[PDB]
Design a protein around this nucleic acid. Structure first.
Lengths: 125, 138, 137
RNA sequence: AUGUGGACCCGCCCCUUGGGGUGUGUCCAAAGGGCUUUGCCCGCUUCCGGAUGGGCCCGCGUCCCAUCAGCUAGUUGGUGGGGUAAUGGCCCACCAAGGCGACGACGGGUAGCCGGUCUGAGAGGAUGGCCGGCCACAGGGGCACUGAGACACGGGCCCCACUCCUACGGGAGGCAGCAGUUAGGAAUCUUCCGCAAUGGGCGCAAGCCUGACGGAGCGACGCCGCUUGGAGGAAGAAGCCCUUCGGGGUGUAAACUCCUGAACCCGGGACGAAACCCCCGAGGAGGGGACUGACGGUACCGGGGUAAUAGCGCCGGCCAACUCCGUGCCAGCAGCCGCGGUAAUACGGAGGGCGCGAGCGUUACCCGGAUUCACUGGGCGUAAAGGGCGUGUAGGCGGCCUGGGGCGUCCCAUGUGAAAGACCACGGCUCAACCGUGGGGGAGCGUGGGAUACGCUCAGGCUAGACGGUGGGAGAGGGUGGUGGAAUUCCCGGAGUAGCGGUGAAAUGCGCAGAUACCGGGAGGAACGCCGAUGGCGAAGGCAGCCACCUGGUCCACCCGUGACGCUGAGGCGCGAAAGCGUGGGGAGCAAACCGGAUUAGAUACCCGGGUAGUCCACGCCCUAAACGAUGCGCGCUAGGUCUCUGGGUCUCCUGGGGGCCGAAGCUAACGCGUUAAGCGCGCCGCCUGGGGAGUACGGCCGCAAGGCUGAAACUCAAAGGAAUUGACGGGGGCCCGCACAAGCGGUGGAGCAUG
RNA sequence: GGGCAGGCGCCGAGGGUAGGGCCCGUGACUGGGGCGAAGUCGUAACAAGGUAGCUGUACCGGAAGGUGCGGCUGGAUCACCUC
RNA sequence: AAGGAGGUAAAAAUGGUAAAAAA
RNA sequence: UCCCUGGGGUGAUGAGCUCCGGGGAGCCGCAGUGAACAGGCUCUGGCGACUGUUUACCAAAAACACAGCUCUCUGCGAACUC
RNA sequence: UGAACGGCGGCCGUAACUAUAACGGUCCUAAGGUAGCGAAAUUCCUUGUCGGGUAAGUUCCGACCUGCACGAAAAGCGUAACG
């Protein structure tokens, strides 16, 4: 590229793509949803994972997951489009929250209460 | 041919340095004379003189070597460790006062041609005059 | 079309959030969200408000039904899979007797080997294909 | 009217874009109000000078797409005009043809710019909210007006939409002003106080308007500081987790003790505010007295005094921390790699501990690590990549020597770079955060002088690079005509008769209608045996009998000449295997497609019989590749030993140019390169930035077609891949060996019978 | 003297007619591609993969594959002409 | 005759068989 | 309508006469090629290549024709044909 | 010998809903219709099924493909210009 050619041309900036088009700057969204199902991760699992299709307040039928055991969710919930794929469900992108307008965590949870709902386990004793 | 008989010289230098051959030749010019002047002038080469080959004026340069140690082969160490042509005919460097490298931060040498003649790092900074940054050597 | 549908989930989003009362619950064994509630004319002028300031095209359907099923007789059959593909086969000759009992009982099956035929690795997975092929009547 | 002055007009002196003066001739002013009045305050009139802001202009810098290549007819320039504060086509006329473009025009996607700001050693990347400056809009568009100033947020007209008020004749309105309603969204507040302080508008002041401003409220949204306590307190009680029944841990932690004393009660109590003002002096300087708090009686000062909130992520490695049941590839965590498929330290629960603590995690966004678009700081033999190769345009850069130049470059002076922030220093609120003051460093362009080392510009000169002159030389180097033999099918003929053919085996196949084989002559086309090579020539793809013709390329010798004429070379140019194509001629052998045959389970294939396209001749058209040395080109440097082909020399040798191998140094991750470098350096072009999608689609250009040159994306995976080492494995090979073949001896299979 | 109104005329917002240009969404149908553990068929590549492979290309076949022309090693050893 | 290398001829009747996995 | 103005031509390089024109402003009406001659146009299938040739007396066409393609026959006493 | 007259199959089964059938078997023949086009000047059931075009579309275009009975020189397909 011998200085000259480098100057004449340019070494272009990498750019991104956002492997996470939650879009608008909105990775928090009103997950309306439709369906539930199950699906499997590669050759060593099988579970649940929803599909929450969401519609946001901008579009997309995504694959909104869930923060795990203890479900209700039926068909609205405002599944809070969040973010993070794995080797499971060809998507796992834009997760759910529990708390939102619905779910509010595992019936009795003692740790991840930062999304898994349950307030402050006051056993009142 | 040649685009830099200077950098080509520096290269033939690097040859004799890396091959351990007491002396090596390089054609007639005033500037090479200035440089090799600086070179002996800081205890590096072994000297220079306006010689000739076939009828063409040249400038031969003898050079310096260290002591012959044992164990890991006999190979004695080099004196003229390495020189790098900085201001290429594409990167016309033009150092000034507050500019200027420090070369091995303390030792080494910068070779640089200024308003008046061919100077060195410590010199040119002492002088307070600058110009093109030729090679580096330590 | 189900495009008008989620659109009307927004309709409900301001319908179920201005008037408590009714319950907008989908059915499981059939699709289509169901409008449940406590009033005839109530649900109806709900639908009017819809075809007024929400303009939905929804041919107000009759509620569907979840239909299970069964039989009433003992049939002996031959589930013989005599198929030797390119060497590995996966052939399975299953001889089953099948018995039916009361509507409300439950699902049965027996660990029934006539002597020691079918491997103990089919036991919890041959009956699967009994269960599996029993979701689709 | 009055006319110091100013305006224009024709001359004129200086000046040099429209800077100042001047001779002639005409036009222009004025506002007066108050009162302590014969004086002053406010204001007016004509101009000159500053102070201030802005207009116009240029210099320079200023996002992405080349799948944005042409753009323009008010368009480029003028004369004369219009208008503006004014140059100018911004608008009129008339007129000459120009004006911008790979230094990326035009078109489009996108963006308000900056002083600054977060990150990184740094280069840079990203960014421009509050704050300060510049711009732009007023719901959308035109529009003028007023005027010192505007195309004017709370002024005017019209049109648009939009929404309202009405007696449905008519009319009204613009929170991108300050709070506040609502849609929007995951999310961004009070429909609060005083003009007490500063500042802006007006007024002689008194003063008045100020949702500027100065304060209160709300939200852990950010940074900052702070309490939940101290101090004694057990081989350590109990409660619980664990255990091998000995205990271990939790933890001085708790309880008990004394102490101090958040929150809270009473009292006093702000700085924030001395000016404006009247008065003595003159209305000046000075001097006096007096007014002025929204917060809030909050800060804070004194005294009385109560121990008085604790969470959030984690404990598989990165990344600091484990034990116990359950769960059983189910429920499930998961940034990455994965963890669980009935003894999970990764899930879920429980003791403990790591961290952090009024915060902790989660996502999103950006910079880094990422040297992972590399300027510092990368690569193209095989992982990503040389363009199939020669031509050269521009451009890029350039050998020795002298002197001018002083453009690039260096140095000191210097204008500006506001403030604020960045740094050090001192300071203020009782620390901090936060703020007060001083000072230096600061890119950058304007202006001055000086330096001429390096690039370049200028004149002159040199021969080392480059071309030429002259003489010899090698070749399968290219276009043409021409000829020789060998050899295959074929015509005529002869002579001979039971098969040939082909193959792993055989068959289809030809044959008593006379074949295969041998001889005599004729037809035709295609490729040249040996020579001949590990060789020669060539830019590459290529060239093979020999003669002649034209003709390039190159080699050495002589130093005769020229004087840097140089290296690369984005587009453009030409060239080009074989297959393919078009228009005609020709076809012996050959041969895809196509048929028979045999083979197998199948044979649309390898093996056999026929047979076509096509392989040949000329013109043209397509232009591809493992076009492979997978290594660009030009030069210079850095060990030699050798086989060989050509150029020069008296020559068992040297030396120019090349063509195989080896191996110093060096280089590379390795194989391997190593004077034909993949080693050590300079110039220049193009090509690469995870595999796949993919050489696909799109646009654009060429083709007669089959296609080609340019060439992404979403999405999908956490790998694809290079090298070498092992080990296996093989229907690659070598070697050795045994009742394996051999060599010999007696048997099995046959019979009846025993038994498995 | 003129002035205001008025009158005609220039430009002009908006709207209307026609035809372009770019981009996006979309669309019966459709090529292709990616993903899912052992599906059904053959077995081409890697040992000469059992016909050495690789490929430019042209004709063919259920498909992978085949084959003619030419090229290329990233192909081949009793032992044949040398280094 | 040592090796290594440089170009010419040799040599496979046929083969379908999978797979989550255990360290 | 009126003001101005360009070149070919003939005659002379001009008068006249003529051809072909450019511009400026002005006048009246419903309208100015004022009447007579005089085309509607675009999108997309079907088939045929295309201009044409055919049924005088119901046809004009997708039938025939055609340039062009292959297949055949003809060694001059051609073969074909009467 | 087929740019000569001409002809250019039938029956069974097979993938993990199902549906379908690259695939194999089988009786027949001289051999079993290649590419391309296809509810067509050919398609009977049929006003076939989907999609556009419309207030409504047996007509029309596009597309699907079980072509009753397309198809290679009575040529198959495609084609700007004319009619």
């Amino acid at each position: 590229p011998t200085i000259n050619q480098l100057v004449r041309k340019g070494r272009e900036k990498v750019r991104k793509k956002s492997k996470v088009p939650a879009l608008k700057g909105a990775p928090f969204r009103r997950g309306v949803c439709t369906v539930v199902r199950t699906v499997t991760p590669k050759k060593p699992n099988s579970a649940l994972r929803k599909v929450a299709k969401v519609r946001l307040t901008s579009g997309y039928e995504v694959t909104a997951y869930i923060p795990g055991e203890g479900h209700n969710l039926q068909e609205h919930s405002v599944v809070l489009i969040r973010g993070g794929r794995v080797k499971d469900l060809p998507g796992v992108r834009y997760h759910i929250v529990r708390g939102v307008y619905d779910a509010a965590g595992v019936k009795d949870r003692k740790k991840s209460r930062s999304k898994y709902g349950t307030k402050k386990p006051k056993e009142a004793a | 041919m040649l685009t830099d008989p200077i950098a080509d010289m520096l290269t033939r230098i690097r040859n004799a340095t890396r091959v351990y051959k007491e002396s090596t030749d390089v054609p007639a010019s005033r500037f090479k004379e200035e440089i090799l002047r600086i070179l002996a002038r800081e205890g590096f080469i072994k000297g220079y003189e306006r010689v000739d080959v076939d009828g063409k004026p040249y400038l031969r340069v003898y050079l310096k070597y260290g002591p012959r140690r044992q164990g890991p082969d006999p190979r004695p160490e080099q004196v003229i460790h390495h020189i790098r042509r900085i201001s290429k005919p594409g990167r016309r460097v033009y150092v000034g006062v507050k500019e200027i490298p420090r070369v091995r931060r303390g030792l080494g040498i910068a070779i640089l041609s200024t308003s008046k003649g061919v100077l060195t790092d410590r010199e040119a900074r002492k002088l307070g005059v600058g110009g093109e940054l030729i090679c580096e050597v330590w | 079309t189900k495009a008008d549908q989620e659109k009307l989930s927004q309709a409900l989003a301001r319908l179920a959030e201005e008037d408590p009362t009714f319950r907008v619950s989908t059915h499981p064994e059939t699709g289509q969200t169901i409008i449940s509630g406590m009033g005839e004319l109530h649900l109806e002028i709900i639908v009017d408000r819809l075809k007024r300031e929400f303009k939905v095209d929804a041919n107000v359907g009759k509620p569907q039904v979840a239909y299970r099923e069964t039989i009433t007789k003992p049939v002996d059959v031959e589930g013989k899979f005599i198929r030797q593909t390119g060497g590995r086969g996966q052939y399975g000759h299953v001889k089953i007797k099948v018995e039916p009992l009361p509507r409300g009982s439950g699902f049965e099956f027996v660990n029934a080997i006539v002597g020691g035929v079918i491997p103990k690795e089919y036991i919890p997975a041959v009956q699967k294909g009994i269960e599996e092929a029993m979701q689709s009547g």
